[PDB]
Design an enzyme around this catalytic site. Structure first.
Site, PDB file in Angstrom:
ATOM      1  N   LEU B   7       1.163  -0.991   0.146  1.00 37.46           N
ATOM      2  CA  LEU B   7       0.264  -0.170  -0.256  1.00 37.46           C
ATOM      3  C   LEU B   7       0.656   1.365   0.094  1.00 37.46           C
ATOM      4  O   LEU B   7       1.332   1.663   0.734  1.00 37.46           O
ATOM      5  CB  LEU B   7      -1.575   0.480   0.769  1.00 37.46           C
ATOM      6  CG  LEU B   7      -1.723  -1.227   1.804  1.00 37.46           C
ATOM      7  CD1 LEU B   7      -2.620  -1.079   2.708  1.00 37.46           C
ATOM      8  CD2 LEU B   7      -2.546  -1.642  -0.319  1.00 37.46           C
ATOM      9  N   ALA B   8       1.090   2.576  -1.548  1.00 41.07           N
ATOM     10  CA  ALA B   8       2.458   3.977  -1.542  1.00 41.07           C
ATOM     11  C   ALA B   8       0.700   4.593  -1.643  1.00 41.07           C
ATOM     12  O   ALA B   8       1.200   5.073  -2.893  1.00 41.07           O
ATOM     13  CB  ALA B   8       2.759   3.201  -2.042  1.00 41.07           C
ATOM     14  N   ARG B  14      -0.109  14.058   8.027  1.00 39.66           N
ATOM     15  CA  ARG B  14       0.929  13.809   9.857  1.00 39.66           C
ATOM     16  C   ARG B  14       2.188  14.951   8.902  1.00 39.66           C
ATOM     17  O   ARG B  14       3.124  14.897  10.113  1.00 39.66           O
ATOM     18  CB  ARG B  14       0.816  13.030  10.663  1.00 39.66           C
ATOM     19  CG  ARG B  14      -0.438  12.664  11.177  1.00 39.66           C
ATOM     20  CD  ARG B  14      -0.685  13.772  12.281  1.00 39.66           C
ATOM     21  NE  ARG B  14      -1.244  13.591  13.586  1.00 39.66           N
ATOM     22  CZ  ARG B  14      -2.585  15.000  13.284  1.00 39.66           C
ATOM     23  NH1 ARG B  14      -2.630  15.843  13.173  1.00 39.66           N
ATOM     24  NH2 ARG B  14      -3.315  14.380  15.077  1.00 39.66           N
ATOM     25  N   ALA B 378      51.574  25.411  -3.170  1.00 40.00           N
ATOM     26  CA  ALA B 378      50.098  25.926  -2.695  1.00 40.00           C
ATOM     27  C   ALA B 378      50.045  27.183  -3.846  1.00 40.00           C
ATOM     28  O   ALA B 378      50.450  28.411  -4.410  1.00 40.00           O
ATOM     29  CB  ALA B 378      50.636  26.505  -1.193  1.00 40.00           C
ATOM     30  N   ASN B 384      39.514  26.869 -16.462  1.00 40.76           N
ATOM     31  CA  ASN B 384      39.232  26.144 -17.158  1.00 40.76           C
ATOM     32  C   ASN B 384      37.680  27.082 -17.703  1.00 40.76           C
ATOM     33  O   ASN B 384      37.214  26.660 -18.846  1.00 40.76           O
ATOM     34  CB  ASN B 384      38.883  25.189 -16.562  1.00 40.76           C
ATOM     35  CG  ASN B 384      36.825  24.770 -16.225  1.00 40.76           C
ATOM     36  OD1 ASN B 384      35.814  24.787 -16.595  1.00 40.76           O
ATOM     37  ND2 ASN B 384      37.822  25.030 -14.789  1.00 40.76           N
ATOM     38  N   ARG B 438      56.032  36.800 -14.886  1.00 43.33           N
ATOM     39  CA  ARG B 438      55.626  37.721 -12.869  1.00 43.33           C
ATOM     40  C   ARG B 438      56.603  39.029 -12.867  1.00 43.33           C
ATOM     41  O   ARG B 438      57.133  39.299 -14.088  1.00 43.33           O
ATOM     42  CB  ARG B 438      55.629  37.416 -12.041  1.00 43.33           C
ATOM     43  CG  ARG B 438      57.109  36.131 -11.866  1.00 43.33           C
ATOM     44  CD  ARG B 438      57.592  35.541 -10.481  1.00 43.33           C
ATOM     45  NE  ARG B 438      58.947  35.009 -10.516  1.00 43.33           N
ATOM     46  CZ  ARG B 438      59.372  33.485 -10.395  1.00 43.33           C
ATOM     47  NH1 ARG B 438      59.012  32.879  -9.992  1.00 43.33           N
ATOM     48  NH2 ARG B 438      60.945  33.978  -9.480  1.00 43.33           N
TER      49      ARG B 438
HETATM   50  C1  UD1 Z   1      -7.063   0.760   8.995  1.00 45.58           C
HETATM   51  C2  UD1 Z   1      -5.775   0.147   9.425  1.00 45.58           C
HETATM   52  O1  UD1 Z   1      -5.173  -0.166   8.288  1.00 45.58           O
HETATM   53  N1  UD1 Z   1      -4.604   1.108   9.934  1.00 45.58           N
HETATM   54  C3  UD1 Z   1      -3.576   0.390  10.119  1.00 45.58           C
HETATM   55  C4  UD1 Z   1      -3.033   1.367   9.649  1.00 45.58           C
HETATM   56  O2  UD1 Z   1      -2.505   2.447  10.470  1.00 45.58           O
HETATM   57  P1  UD1 Z   1      -2.082   3.705   9.594  1.00 45.58           P
HETATM   58  O3  UD1 Z   1      -2.486   5.107  10.468  1.00 45.58           O
HETATM   59  O4  UD1 Z   1      -0.828   4.659   9.959  1.00 45.58           O
HETATM   60  O5  UD1 Z   1      -2.340   3.560   8.513  1.00 45.58           O
HETATM   61  P2  UD1 Z   1      -1.705   5.540   7.178  1.00 45.58           P
HETATM   62  O6  UD1 Z   1      -2.560   5.971   7.122  1.00 45.58           O
HETATM   63  O7  UD1 Z   1      -0.314   5.240   7.507  1.00 45.58           O
HETATM   64  O8  UD1 Z   1      -2.013   4.446   5.743  1.00 45.58           O
HETATM   65  C5  UD1 Z   1      -1.614   2.498   5.513  1.00 45.58           C
HETATM   66  C6  UD1 Z   1      -0.719   2.425   3.846  1.00 45.58           C
HETATM   67  O9  UD1 Z   1      -2.310   2.335   3.772  1.00 45.58           O
HETATM   68  C7  UD1 Z   1      -1.550   3.478   3.148  1.00 45.58           C
HETATM   69  N2  UD1 Z   1      -2.864   4.216   2.347  1.00 45.58           N
HETATM   70  C8  UD1 Z   1      -3.947   4.387   3.256  1.00 45.58           C
HETATM   71  C9  UD1 Z   1      -4.715   4.873   2.726  1.00 45.58           C
HETATM   72  C10 UD1 Z   1      -5.837   4.717   1.553  1.00 45.58           C
HETATM   73  O10 UD1 Z   1      -6.687   5.608   1.177  1.00 45.58           O
HETATM   74  N3  UD1 Z   1      -4.802   3.989   0.685  1.00 45.58           N
HETATM   75  C11 UD1 Z   1      -3.596   3.822   1.360  1.00 45.58           C
HETATM   76  O11 UD1 Z   1      -2.606   3.325  -0.003  1.00 45.58           O
HETATM   77  C12 UD1 Z   1      -0.692   4.849   3.446  1.00 45.58           C
HETATM   78  O12 UD1 Z   1       0.237   4.790   2.027  1.00 45.58           O
HETATM   79  C13 UD1 Z   1       0.311   3.233   4.381  1.00 45.58           C
HETATM   80  O13 UD1 Z   1       1.211   2.953   3.518  1.00 45.58           O
HETATM   81  O14 UD1 Z   1      -0.862   0.815   9.755  1.00 45.58           O
HETATM   82  C14 UD1 Z   1      -0.517   0.723  11.177  1.00 45.58           C
HETATM   83  C15 UD1 Z   1       0.757   0.102  11.647  1.00 45.58           C
HETATM   84  O15 UD1 Z   1       1.822   0.934  10.807  1.00 45.58           O
HETATM   85  C16 UD1 Z   1      -2.089  -0.190  11.894  1.00 45.58           C
HETATM   86  O16 UD1 Z   1      -1.977  -0.359  13.341  1.00 45.58           O
HETATM   87  C17 UD1 Z   1      -3.585   0.333  11.454  1.00 45.58           C
HETATM   88  O17 UD1 Z   1      -3.785  -0.595  12.168  1.00 45.58           O
END
Ligand code: UD1
Ligand code: UD1
Ligand code: UD1
Ligand code: MG
Ligand code: MG
Ligand code: MG
Ligand code: NA
Lengths: 446, 446, 446
Positions: B7-8, B14, B378, B384, B438
């Protein structure tokens, strides 16, 4: 109605310093100033700072911000509070007494302390904390039902009492009226032969007066700085506090435990700070700016998108997109325009540098007014001092100062002029002109 | 058969950054890349990276290494996994779901997780850990007999649930077939109004499906990076990991907690590294080489028996026995031959320097091809740049370039030639010849 | 009567070094020397150091300070002690056996150990400690009534024994007479096939001989250095110890955890040391002196009231009130008189600089005898090397060396003389004279 008493008259013997203990700095300002800032949170109607040992140095620091009372002889913390009688005696309200060597206590903590005092309707409330190494701190003695009985100093404590982990932070809130009457009953019958302020707790208990204790949420705030070992700990905690605030604000730190940023330094979001970067005084850093290891900035303003690589900058202004370093030195009263490039082994002193100007190597620019798009060849030396007087040099826009040239002030290099490399310039160079002042090359075959 | 979902696509609010959170670097590479490297340990047959917020930046980083699916709107972690349906729906196997902001989880941990999942024949296995400060993490809720009931987010947790120390790492292994059917039952009835992936645990329990939890051996790996405070912690743990590996490999560190070495940096045995040394990118350090405090090397190769004292080296090659510093700067596309000595305040840029050549002070060597056993006095400055074009200078072997000389390209100094100190050279100097350019010294008595 | 046996013959395989393990440095001196210094606290009548692996290197370090015995083959710690038989066999007294890789054990601890041994009238006393990670250490096995039964090595320990937190520090005190007889009973029946010294404990118990264990007050002293990870920990603890002593002595440290000061460095009270300052060897710092981040001093003496800003100083003497930096380099055999100012990008080598002399920028002073109140303009280069020989230059008092000048030795600039900026000086300049050697400026209009 809140009143405040800050104790800053002590000798601070363990510090082994000629400078009064409270004046020793933590993150750019004295411990006394950190304490004064916290005190302001309770919005005191009157603030009295007890001075004595080198009072003039202390009075200068907080001049015009608090009333001062002199304690001719350092006879004790209780005796120090007695010096505030001519000013506070008779008044009705909650009087806070705080030491000038506990720089970690926050204003938020002092607010919670006074609120606790008022709510519980105490005659005296002690700010306490707990620690595994209570050595040097007064111990909080309670009975079976956790009621505060008294405060016993390290030097007066029994082996049983020394085992107590709950310590006195040196901060209290006393009912102003009852405070000064209880002070009259303090005796010098102790290991130090001093008037302990801590004794008022026992004195209040004699007449069954209500005494309580408010415990700090964060025990790190309880640090009492009596020596330089404790001062380093204060620096460590304050450094962590400051850097944490910056990270929450969107600033990246490769190592917040090894980055040195003063209390009043302002840093915009997206700034990247490598470890071992030092920012002191009234320094401001613009958005997205990158600061690399070794960079040291004092009382300077740096714009957005700048990159300061391992360089020292003092009392100067640096615009947006400026690139500096590594090993560059921007001295006091200098100004670097937008997108200026200052490279390695370059010193700029008391000079204004126009936009897009470049001085990338082994160059000294002193007391010069430089235009935009100027190029300083490597080894360019400006001369402003002759032995008695200081002369100014003016360099126009688009000037090309040849490498290893020597520009002797006072002279002016007009717009679009060019100075041949290796030349010594002693006279004005008109705009669009070419100046050359070097010897001809002669080869001798062998 | 193993499958992987990274998931990215999140916004990473924050972080307070324009750069997608997962792309923020830890020890030289993005958090996403650290996660991708760990994933490879399970040898997945298919890898899908969910992108959304500034997907083009993310796709560039892992281009050609994973399949990508777009999540138009960031409606939740569960919703993100749903985007992988067109690719994974129907397939049979164990599907790993991992967040791109947990860069500390190791491949070894992911292998143990999948092995646990298969062995216990679970429909869902959660990677968990325990911490004294679980704020922000989903809590693992179990019953009397330690059976996993569900995962409750910070914002949805009761005060009783907030006290739970066992946290969700955001990494799980789901039975691929049962995963997508359970995803259809996720609702937005929560504090965020999002589709939580964490909810599939409760959904599986409705039909009595087996759900388990594998606990990390090292709790430090559980770090979830949501802000820059957490990012600094990730840097700290990764830095400790990298340096520990180097020490086990026979590298000495005066202070491994304050030395900054990127993830892919290679260091031979017997190398001595002082504190505050920075090694970045594709940097390689040969055997017995000494690196002192302040040395900063980026994408460079340094040989064996070299001594780099407080110097910055970029995109260059440094041979065996080379001595550099202090305060030297080796810029891009430079090559220092065996036993070359570069001293203080010397800059080498886009130049090749032959064996045993010495430039010990205040010298700028740019765009030069230098032979062996050459000596730069020195203050030697090579030129250049003229304002528009860049010219090359060739210096033969055994050439003695006099101090404070200015060599103006394009010129060639033949083998065994000598340039008199303080000379400005504008023309070729034949081999074995002596060049002087010089002015003559005139003393005026007083 | 006390005797001492220091084991320093091991191979130290885990170190992955050609240098004998005991010779690896911690805070400026080898681990062996730290151990030797601690041993001296017991005032031994005889001291024997067991050497073997590269004995010549080890013997050089402690030459003339201890007797040496060779252990041809590294057959074990017990076997090593056997090599001391020809010297200690027969003598009556308490024999201390200590490893050369436990540099943190203090002399105070060794005194307490021997006192415990004598008081309890033991035949053998083991110095022990407790740790949560006892891996690699011999475990102390006791019975129900806390009596020491034996010492079991990591490689020979059962899973139950591996859980033991009480470890052997490798330091013991044996009754000299009973020691050598018990050594004869040691067998090679173990995982390593070596003669363990730890086995004498079990051997003594066979004849009901009294064996005890003295526990260290500070568990940090128990560190056994077998690899570079442990060596870094030793550096960390020793660094904390050294800096703590300095702070108690009245020295301020912005960050004592990131400041590198060697074991024998002396620092006066009131000195201010920023983080990342390095002081090595026989270095001494005078009262009130300020050292800023990056300053690196080796075998040098710096006076009182000096300010060393981010500069490197080697084998030199710096008087009171001297100001240096930032980025200055004082090389070996240099002397800076009272109130001398050395600025940025200035190198001083093998030269004496008189009082109040200033060289603030891009200057190289080598092999020069300089008077008082001399002023070196920016870019001043002194030439002492011609290709084969080294020549000396003498500069009188109140001399004004013009900026970007080149002074070619051997020459003398008389008192009150002046060298015009950009001049190349090849001949003596009489006192009060003015020397100029540069080309005339010609402007060409356009
Ligand atoms: C609901 C959920 O999963 N909560 C978990 C999430 O919280 P946390 O609040 O940290 O979740 P993030 O907002 O960081 O999202 C987690 C990952 O999912 C991705 N992302 C988020 C939202 C979206 O709509 N699409 C998407 O791809 C973010 O890019 C990230 O890589 O990770 C924590 C650990 O680090 C866990 O303790 C939490 O239980
Ligand atoms: C007797 C007393 O109060 N002891 C408290 C004091 O100990 P501690 O031994 O730390 O007391 P200090 O010597 O530091 O004095 C405290 C403060 O009072 C000042 N001062 C001192 C003597 C004097 O005659 N005039 C004067 O103004 C000092 O400048 C300092 O600001 O602080 C500790 C917390 O940090 C507490 O645990 C102790 O219970
Ligand atoms: C069998 C033995 O003693 N084990 C102890 C040794 O383990 P450890 O495995 O650390 O023992 P080392 O290999 O470090 O040897 C200890 C010392 O004896 C020397 N040496 C070693 C072999 C040799 O044949 N000749 C020789 O002189 C080494 O140079 C070193 O100074 O120290 C640890 C504490 O640090 C203890 O917890 C172990 O109980
Ligand atoms: Mg105090
Ligand atoms: Mg997260
Ligand atoms: Mg050992
Ligand atoms: Na020059």
């Amino acid at each position: 109605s809140n009143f405040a008493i800050i104790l800053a008259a002590g000798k601070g013997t363990r510090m082994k310093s000629d400078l009064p203990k409270v004046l020793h700095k933590v993150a750019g300002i004295s411990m006394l100033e950190h304490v004064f800032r916290s005190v302001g949170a309770i919005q005191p109607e009157k603030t009295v700072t007890v001075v004595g040992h080198k009072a003039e140095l202390v009075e200068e620091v907080l001049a015009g911000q608090t009333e001062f009372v002199t304690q001719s002889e350092q006879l004790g913390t209780g005796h120090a509070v007695m010096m505030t009688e001519p000013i506070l005696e008779g008044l009705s309200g909650h009087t806070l007494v705080i030491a000038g060597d506990t720089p970690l206590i926050t204003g938020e903590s002092l607010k919670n302390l006074i609120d606790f005092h008022i709510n519980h309707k105490n005659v005296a409330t002690i700010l306490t904390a707990e620690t595994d190494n209570p050595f040097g701190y007064g111990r909080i003695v309670r009975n079976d039902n956790a009621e505060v009985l008294r405060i016993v100093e390290q030097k007066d404590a029994t082996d049983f009492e020394k085992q107590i982990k709950e310590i006195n932070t040196g901060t209290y809130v006393f009912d102003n009226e009852r405070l000064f009457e209880a002070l009259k009953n303090i005796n010098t019958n102790n290991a130090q032969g001093e008037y302990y302020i801590t004794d008022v707790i026992g004195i209040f208990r004699e007449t069954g007066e209500k005494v309580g204790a408010y415990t700090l949420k964060d025990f790190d705030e309880s640090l009492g700085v009596n020596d330089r070992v404790a001062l380093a700990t204060a620096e460590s905690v304050m450094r962590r506090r400051i850097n944490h605030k910056h990270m929450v604000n969107g600033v990246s730190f490769v190592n917040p435990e090894a980055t040195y940023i003063d209390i009043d330094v302002e840093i915009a979001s997206e700034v990247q700070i490598e470890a071992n970067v030092t920012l002191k005084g009234q320094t401001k850093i613009g958005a997205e700016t990158v600061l690399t290891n070794g960079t040291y900035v004092v009382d300077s303003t740096i714009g957005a998108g700048a990159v300061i690589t391992n360089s020292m900058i003092e009392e100067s202004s640096v615009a947006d997109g400026v690139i500096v370093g590594p090993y560059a030195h921007i001295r006091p009263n200098s100004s670097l325009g937008a997108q200026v490039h200052i490279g390695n082994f370059v010193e700029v002193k008391g000079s204004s540098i126009g936009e897009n100007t470049k001085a990338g190597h082994l160059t000294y620019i002193g007391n010069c007014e430089v235009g935009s798009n100027v190029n300083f060849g490597a080894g360019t030396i400006t001369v402003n001092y002759d032995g008695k007087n200081k002369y100014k040099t003016v360099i126009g826009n688009n000037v090309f100062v040849g490498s290893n040239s020597t520009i002797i002030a006072p002279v002016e290099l007009g717009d679009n002029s060019l100075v041949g490399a290796g030349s010594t310039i002693t006279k004005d160079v008109p705009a669009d002109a070419i100046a050359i002042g070097r010897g001809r090359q002669i080869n001798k075959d062998e």
